[PDB]
Short mmCIF file of C-alpha atoms and ligand atoms in Angstrom, two decimals:
data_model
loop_
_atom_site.label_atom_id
_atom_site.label_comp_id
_atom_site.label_asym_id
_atom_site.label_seq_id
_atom_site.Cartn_x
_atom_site.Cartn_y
_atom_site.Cartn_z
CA UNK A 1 -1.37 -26.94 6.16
CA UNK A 2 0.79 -24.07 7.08
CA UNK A 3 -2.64 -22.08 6.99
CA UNK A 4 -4.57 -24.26 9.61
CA UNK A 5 -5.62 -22.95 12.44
CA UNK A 6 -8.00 -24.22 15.60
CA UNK A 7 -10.14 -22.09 17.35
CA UNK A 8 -10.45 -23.13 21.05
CA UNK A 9 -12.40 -21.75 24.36
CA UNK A 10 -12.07 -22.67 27.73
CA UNK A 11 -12.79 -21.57 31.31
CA UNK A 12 -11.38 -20.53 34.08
CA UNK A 13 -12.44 -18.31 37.17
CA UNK A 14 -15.77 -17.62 36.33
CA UNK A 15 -13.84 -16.14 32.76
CA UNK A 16 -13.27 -17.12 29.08
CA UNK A 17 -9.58 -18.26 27.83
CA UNK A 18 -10.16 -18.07 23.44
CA UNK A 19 -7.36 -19.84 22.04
CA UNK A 20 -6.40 -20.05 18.49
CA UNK A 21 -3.92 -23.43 17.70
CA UNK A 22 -1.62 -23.67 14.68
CA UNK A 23 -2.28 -27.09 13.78
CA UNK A 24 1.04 -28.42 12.15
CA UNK A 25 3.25 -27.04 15.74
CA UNK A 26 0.72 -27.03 18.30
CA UNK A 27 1.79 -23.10 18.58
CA UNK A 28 -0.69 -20.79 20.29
CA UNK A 29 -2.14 -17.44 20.93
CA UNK A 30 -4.61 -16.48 23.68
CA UNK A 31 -6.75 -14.06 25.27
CA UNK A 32 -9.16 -13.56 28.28
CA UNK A 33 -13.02 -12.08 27.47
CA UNK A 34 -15.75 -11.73 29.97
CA UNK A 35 -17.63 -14.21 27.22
CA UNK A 36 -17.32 -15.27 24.03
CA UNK A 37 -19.61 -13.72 21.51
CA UNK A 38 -19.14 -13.39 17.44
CA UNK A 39 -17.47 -9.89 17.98
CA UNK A 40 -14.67 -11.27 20.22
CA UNK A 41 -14.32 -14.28 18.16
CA UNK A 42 -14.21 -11.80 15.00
CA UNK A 43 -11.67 -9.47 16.50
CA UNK A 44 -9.52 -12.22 17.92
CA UNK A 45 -8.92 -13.45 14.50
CA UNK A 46 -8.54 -10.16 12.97
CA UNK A 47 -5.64 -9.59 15.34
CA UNK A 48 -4.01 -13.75 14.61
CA UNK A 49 -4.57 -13.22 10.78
CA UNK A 50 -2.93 -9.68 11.06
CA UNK A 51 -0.11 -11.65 12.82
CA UNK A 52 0.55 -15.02 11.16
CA UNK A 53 -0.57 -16.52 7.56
CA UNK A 54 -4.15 -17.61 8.43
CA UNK A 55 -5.41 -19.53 5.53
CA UNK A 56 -7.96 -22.04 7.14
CA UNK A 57 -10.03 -21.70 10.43
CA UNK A 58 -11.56 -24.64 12.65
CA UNK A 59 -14.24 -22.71 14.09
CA UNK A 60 -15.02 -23.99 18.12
CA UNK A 61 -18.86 -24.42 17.85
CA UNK A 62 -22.05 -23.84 15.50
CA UNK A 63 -22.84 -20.12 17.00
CA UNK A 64 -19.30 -18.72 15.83
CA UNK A 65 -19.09 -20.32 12.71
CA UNK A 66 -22.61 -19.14 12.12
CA UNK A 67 -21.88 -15.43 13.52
CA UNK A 68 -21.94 -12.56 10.78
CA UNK A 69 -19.46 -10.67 12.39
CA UNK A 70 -17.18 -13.66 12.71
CA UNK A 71 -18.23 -14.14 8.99
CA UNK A 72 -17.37 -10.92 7.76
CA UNK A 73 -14.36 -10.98 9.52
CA UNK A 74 -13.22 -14.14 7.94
CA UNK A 75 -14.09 -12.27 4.35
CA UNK A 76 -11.96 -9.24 5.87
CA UNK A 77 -9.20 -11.27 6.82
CA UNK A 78 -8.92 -13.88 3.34
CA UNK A 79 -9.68 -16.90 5.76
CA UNK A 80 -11.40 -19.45 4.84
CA UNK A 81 -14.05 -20.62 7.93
CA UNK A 82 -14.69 -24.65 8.33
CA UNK A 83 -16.41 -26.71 10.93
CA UNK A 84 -13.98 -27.92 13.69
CA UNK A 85 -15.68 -31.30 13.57
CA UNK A 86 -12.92 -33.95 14.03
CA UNK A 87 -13.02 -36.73 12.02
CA UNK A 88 -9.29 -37.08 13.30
CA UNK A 89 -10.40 -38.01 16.96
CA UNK A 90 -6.92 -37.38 17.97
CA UNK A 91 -7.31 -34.13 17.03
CA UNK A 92 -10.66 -33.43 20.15
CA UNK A 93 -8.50 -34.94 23.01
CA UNK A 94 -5.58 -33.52 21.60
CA UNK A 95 -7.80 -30.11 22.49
CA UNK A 96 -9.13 -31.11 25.77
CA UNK A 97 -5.57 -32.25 26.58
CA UNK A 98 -3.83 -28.58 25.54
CA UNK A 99 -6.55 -26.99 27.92
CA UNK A 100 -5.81 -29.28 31.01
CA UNK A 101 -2.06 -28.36 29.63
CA UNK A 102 -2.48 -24.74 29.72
CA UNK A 103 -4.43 -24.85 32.89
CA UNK A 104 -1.56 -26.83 34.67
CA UNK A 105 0.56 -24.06 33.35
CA UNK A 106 -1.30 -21.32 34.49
CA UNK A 107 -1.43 -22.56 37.75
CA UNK A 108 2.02 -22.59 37.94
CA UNK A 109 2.45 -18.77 37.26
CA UNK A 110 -0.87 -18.01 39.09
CA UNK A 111 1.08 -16.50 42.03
CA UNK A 112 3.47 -13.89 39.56
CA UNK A 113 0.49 -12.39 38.23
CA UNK A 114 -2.44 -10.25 39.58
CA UNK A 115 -4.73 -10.04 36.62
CA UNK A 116 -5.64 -14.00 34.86
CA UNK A 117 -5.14 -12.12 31.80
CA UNK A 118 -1.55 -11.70 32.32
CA UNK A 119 -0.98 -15.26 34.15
CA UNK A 120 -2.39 -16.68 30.54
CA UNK A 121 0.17 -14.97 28.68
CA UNK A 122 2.78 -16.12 30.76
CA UNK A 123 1.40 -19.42 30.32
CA UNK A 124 1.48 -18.76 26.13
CA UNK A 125 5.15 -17.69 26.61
CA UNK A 126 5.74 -21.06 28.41
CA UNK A 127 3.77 -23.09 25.96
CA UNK A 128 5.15 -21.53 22.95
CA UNK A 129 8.83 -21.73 24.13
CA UNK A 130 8.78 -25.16 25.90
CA UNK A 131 11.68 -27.20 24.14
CA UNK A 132 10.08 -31.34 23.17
CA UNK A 133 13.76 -30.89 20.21
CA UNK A 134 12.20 -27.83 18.96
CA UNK A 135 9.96 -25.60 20.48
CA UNK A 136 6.10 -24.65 18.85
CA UNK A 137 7.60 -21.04 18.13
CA UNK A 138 10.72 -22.78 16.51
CA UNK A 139 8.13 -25.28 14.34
CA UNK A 140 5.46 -22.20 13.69
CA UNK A 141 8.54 -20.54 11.89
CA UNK A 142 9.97 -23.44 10.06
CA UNK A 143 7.39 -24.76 8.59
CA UNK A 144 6.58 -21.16 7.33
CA UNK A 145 9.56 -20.25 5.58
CA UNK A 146 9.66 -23.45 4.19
CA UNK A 147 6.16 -22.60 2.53
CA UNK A 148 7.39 -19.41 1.44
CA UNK A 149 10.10 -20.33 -0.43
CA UNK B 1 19.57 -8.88 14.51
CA UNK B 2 16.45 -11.23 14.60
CA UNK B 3 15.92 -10.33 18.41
CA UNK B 4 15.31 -6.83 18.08
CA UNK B 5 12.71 -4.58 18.62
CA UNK B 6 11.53 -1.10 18.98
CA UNK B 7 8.72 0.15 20.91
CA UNK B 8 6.65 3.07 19.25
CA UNK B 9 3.90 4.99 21.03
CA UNK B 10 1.38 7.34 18.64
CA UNK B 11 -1.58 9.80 19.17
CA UNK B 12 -5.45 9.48 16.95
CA UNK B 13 -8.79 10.22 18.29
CA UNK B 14 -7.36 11.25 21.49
CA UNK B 15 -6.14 7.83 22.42
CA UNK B 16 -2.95 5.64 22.16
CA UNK B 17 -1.63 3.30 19.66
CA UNK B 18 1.21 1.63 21.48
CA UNK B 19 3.80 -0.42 18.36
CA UNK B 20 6.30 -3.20 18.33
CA UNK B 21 7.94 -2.77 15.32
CA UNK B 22 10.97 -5.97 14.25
CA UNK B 23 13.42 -3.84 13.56
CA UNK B 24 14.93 -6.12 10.84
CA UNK B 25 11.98 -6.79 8.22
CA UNK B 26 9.39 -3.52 9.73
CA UNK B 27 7.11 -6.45 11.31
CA UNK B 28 4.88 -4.70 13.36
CA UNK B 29 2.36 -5.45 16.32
CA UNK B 30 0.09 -3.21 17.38
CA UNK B 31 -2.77 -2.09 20.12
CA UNK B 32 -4.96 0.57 20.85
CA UNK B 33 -4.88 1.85 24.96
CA UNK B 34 -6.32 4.65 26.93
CA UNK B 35 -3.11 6.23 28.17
CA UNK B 36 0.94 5.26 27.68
CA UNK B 37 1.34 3.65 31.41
CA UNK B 38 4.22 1.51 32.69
CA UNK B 39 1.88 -1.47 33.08
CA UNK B 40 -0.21 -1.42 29.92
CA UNK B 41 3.83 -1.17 28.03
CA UNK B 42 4.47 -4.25 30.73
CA UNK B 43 1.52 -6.18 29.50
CA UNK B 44 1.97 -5.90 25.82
CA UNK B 45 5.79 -6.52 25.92
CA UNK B 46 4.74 -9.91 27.88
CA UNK B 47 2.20 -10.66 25.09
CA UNK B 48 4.76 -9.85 22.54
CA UNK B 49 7.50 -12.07 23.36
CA UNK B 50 5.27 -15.51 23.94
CA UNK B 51 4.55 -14.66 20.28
CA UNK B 52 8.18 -14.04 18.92
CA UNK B 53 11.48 -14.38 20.06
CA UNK B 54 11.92 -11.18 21.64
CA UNK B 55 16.07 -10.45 22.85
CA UNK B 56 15.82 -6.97 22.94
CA UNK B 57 13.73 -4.32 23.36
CA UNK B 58 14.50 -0.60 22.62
CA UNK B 59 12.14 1.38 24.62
CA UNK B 60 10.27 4.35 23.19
CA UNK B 61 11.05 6.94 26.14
CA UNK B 62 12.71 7.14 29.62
CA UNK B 63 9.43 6.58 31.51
CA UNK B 64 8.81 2.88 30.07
CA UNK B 65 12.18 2.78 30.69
CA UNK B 66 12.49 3.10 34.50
CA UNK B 67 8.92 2.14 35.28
CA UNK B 68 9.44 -0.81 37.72
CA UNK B 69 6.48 -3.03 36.17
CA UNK B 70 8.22 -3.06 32.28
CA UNK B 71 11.58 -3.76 34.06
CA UNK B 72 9.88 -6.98 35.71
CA UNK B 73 8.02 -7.92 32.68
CA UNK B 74 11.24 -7.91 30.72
CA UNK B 75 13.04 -9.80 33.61
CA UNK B 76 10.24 -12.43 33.40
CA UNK B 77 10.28 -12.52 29.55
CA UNK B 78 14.10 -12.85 29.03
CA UNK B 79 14.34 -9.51 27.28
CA UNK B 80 17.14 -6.75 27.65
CA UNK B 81 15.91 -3.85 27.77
CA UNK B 82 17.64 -0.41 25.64
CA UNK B 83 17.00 3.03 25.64
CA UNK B 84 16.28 2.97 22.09
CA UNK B 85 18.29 6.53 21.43
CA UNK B 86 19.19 6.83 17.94
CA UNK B 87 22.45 6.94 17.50
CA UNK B 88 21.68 6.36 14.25
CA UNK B 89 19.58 9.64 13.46
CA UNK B 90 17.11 7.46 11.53
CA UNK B 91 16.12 5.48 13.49
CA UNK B 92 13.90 8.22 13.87
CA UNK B 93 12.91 9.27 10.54
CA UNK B 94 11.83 5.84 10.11
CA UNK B 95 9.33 5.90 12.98
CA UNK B 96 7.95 9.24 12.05
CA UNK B 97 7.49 7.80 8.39
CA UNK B 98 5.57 5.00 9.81
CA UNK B 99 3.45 6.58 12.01
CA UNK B 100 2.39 8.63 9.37
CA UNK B 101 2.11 5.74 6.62
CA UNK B 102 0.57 3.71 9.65
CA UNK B 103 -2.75 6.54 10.12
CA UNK B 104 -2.45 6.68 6.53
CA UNK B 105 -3.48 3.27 6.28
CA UNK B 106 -5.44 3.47 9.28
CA UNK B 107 -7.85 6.52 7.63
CA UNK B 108 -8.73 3.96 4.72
CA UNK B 109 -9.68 1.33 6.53
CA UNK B 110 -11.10 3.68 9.06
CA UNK B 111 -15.04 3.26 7.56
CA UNK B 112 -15.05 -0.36 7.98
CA UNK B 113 -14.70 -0.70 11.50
CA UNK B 114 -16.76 1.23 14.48
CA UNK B 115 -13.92 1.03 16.82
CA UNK B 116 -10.27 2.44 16.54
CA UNK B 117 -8.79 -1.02 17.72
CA UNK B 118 -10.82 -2.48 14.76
CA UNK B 119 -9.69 -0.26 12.49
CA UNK B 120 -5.66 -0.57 13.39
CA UNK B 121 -5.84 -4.54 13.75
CA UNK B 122 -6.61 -3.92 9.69
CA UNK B 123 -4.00 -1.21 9.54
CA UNK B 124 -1.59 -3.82 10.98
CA UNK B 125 -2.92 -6.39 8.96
CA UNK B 126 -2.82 -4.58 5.43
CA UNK B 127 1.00 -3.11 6.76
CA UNK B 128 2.31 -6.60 7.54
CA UNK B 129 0.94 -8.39 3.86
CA UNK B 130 1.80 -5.54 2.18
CA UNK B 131 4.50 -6.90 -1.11
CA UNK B 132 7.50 -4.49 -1.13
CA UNK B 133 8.70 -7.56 -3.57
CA UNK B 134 8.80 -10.17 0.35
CA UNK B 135 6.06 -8.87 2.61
CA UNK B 136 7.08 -7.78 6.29
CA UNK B 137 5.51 -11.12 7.48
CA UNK B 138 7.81 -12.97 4.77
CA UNK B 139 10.57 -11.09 5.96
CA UNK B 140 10.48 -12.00 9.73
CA UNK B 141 9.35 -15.45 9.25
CA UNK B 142 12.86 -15.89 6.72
CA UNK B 143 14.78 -13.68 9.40
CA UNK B 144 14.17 -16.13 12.20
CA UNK B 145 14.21 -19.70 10.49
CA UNK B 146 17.78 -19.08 9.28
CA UNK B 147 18.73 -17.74 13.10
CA UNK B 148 16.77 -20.77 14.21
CA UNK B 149 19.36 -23.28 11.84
C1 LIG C 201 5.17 -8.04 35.53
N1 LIG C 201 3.99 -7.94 36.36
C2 LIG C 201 2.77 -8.54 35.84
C3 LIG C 201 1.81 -7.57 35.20
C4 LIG C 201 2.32 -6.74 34.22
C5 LIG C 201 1.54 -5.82 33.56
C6 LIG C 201 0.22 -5.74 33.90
C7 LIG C 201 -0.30 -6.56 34.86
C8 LIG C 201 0.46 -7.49 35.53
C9 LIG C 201 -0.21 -8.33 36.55
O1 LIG C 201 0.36 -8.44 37.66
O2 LIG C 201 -1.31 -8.85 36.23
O3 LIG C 201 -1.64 -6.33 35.05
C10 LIG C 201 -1.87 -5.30 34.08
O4 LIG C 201 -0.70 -4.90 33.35
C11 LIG C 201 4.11 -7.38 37.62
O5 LIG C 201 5.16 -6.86 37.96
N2 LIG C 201 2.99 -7.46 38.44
C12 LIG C 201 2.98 -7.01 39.82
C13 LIG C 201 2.23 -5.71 39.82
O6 LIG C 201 2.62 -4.76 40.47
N3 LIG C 201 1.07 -5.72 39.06
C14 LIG C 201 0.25 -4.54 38.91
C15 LIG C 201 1.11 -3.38 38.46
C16 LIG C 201 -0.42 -4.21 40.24
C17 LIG C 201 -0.83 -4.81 37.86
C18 LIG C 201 2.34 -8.01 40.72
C19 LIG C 201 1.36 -7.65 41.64
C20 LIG C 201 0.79 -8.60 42.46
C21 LIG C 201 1.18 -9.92 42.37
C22 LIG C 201 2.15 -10.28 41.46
C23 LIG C 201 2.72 -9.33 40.65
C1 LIG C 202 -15.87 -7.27 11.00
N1 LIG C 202 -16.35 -6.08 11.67
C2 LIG C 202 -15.39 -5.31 12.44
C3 LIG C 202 -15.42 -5.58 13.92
C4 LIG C 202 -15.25 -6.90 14.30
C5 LIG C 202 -15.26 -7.28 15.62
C6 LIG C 202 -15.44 -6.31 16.56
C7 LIG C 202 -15.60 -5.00 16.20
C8 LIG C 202 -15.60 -4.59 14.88
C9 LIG C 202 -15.78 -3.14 14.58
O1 LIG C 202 -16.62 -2.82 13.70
O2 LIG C 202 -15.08 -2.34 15.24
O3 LIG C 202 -15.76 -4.20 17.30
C10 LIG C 202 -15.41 -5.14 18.33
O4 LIG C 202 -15.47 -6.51 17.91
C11 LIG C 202 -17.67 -5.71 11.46
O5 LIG C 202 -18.43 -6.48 10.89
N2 LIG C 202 -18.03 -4.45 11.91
C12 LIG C 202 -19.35 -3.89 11.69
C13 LIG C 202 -20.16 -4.14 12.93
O6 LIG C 202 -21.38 -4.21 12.84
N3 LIG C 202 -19.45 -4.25 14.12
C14 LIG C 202 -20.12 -4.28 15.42
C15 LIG C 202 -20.95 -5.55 15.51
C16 LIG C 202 -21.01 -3.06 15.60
C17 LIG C 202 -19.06 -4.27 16.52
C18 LIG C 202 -19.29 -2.44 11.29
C19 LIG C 202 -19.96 -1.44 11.96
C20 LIG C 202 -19.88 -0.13 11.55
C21 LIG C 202 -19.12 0.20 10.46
C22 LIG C 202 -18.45 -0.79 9.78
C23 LIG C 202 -18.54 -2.10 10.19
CL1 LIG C 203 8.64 -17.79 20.94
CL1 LIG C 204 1.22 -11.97 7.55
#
């Protein structure tokens, strides 16, 4: 559970936002690619498990999971790869609800930014620090040092 | 203690590897860029600190520190930023020793990956797990919980 991790892609200005979602904290990391495709999918998690713990991965769609470069990347990385179907419908909206989320966020920052590639990580700074209480960088860390010891 | 950070810029296959290192546990973050500029330092400090909690930042040379776009990124992000002189001489042993140990690991891994960014992601990756025996990823994980409480 500590492991758990949601891969998620959305769009915005004619661009791609990939999103990866810590499951138990609802803590994120993003990036902006021209499109997804198995090699940005493969590198993006190279760089999270490189990062943060990952045990489990909730692929987004068929084409990723089925990807051999997100495949061997998963071997590279120790993660184990499953299929993102929710059988915890909470779990979809709770998705399409973080996008409209980070959208509204990115908005918001729009203007302080030139580049939508920096607005989103001002809008992962937000998200991640965003008090509701404990923030999803507080949780992220808490419930990993718990596991550890 | 648990805010802290040093900034570390290294040369390989005539391009830049631009490091965050935690100064604390020797958590490090990592990317691969064309050329040391003010904005890509900007960019990556912005993406660092929406992933950690980032107080302080000691800057790997003057330029980064004067250029006007890391002083705004460090305004937006909350993080004070120090001209990371050692006063203590090492400090600066210790960055040379993990450069080196960082292109050591880098030259093993190199095989597996086409691409240079590839290949450090794995460098960072193998680096962060690696048991010294906590990891550097069990170290700043334990660091910031016990701040956090
Ligand atoms: C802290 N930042 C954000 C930032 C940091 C690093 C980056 C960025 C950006 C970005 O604006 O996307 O793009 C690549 O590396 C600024 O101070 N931005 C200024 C600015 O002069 N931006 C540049 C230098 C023309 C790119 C700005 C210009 C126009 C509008 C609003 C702000
Ligand atoms: C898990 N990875 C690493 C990887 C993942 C994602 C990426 C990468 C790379 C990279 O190799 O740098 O480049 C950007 O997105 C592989 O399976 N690499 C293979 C491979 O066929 N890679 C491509 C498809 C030619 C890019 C490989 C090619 C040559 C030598 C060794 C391995
Ligand atoms: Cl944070
Ligand atoms: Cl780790």
């Amino acid at each position: 559970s500590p492991g758990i991790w949601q891969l998620d892609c959305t769009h915005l200005e004619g661009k791609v936002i990939l999103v990866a979602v810590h499951v138990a904290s609802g803590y994120i990391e993003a990036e902006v690619i021209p499109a997804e495709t198995g090699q940005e999918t493969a590198y993006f998690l190279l760089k999270l498990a490189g990062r943060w713990p990952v045990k489990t991965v909730h692929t987004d769609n068929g084409s990723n999971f089925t990807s051999t470069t997100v495949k061997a990347a998963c071997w590279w990385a120790g993660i184990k790869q499953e299929d993102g179907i929710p059988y915890n419908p909470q779990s979809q909206g709770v998705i399409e609800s973080m996008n409209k989320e980070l959208k509204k966020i990115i908005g918001q920052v729009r203007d302080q930014a030139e580049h939508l590639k920096t607005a989103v990580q001002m809008a992962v700074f937000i998200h991640n620090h965003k008090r509701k209480g404990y923030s999803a960088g507080e949780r992220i860390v808490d419930i990993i040092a718990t596991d550890i010891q």
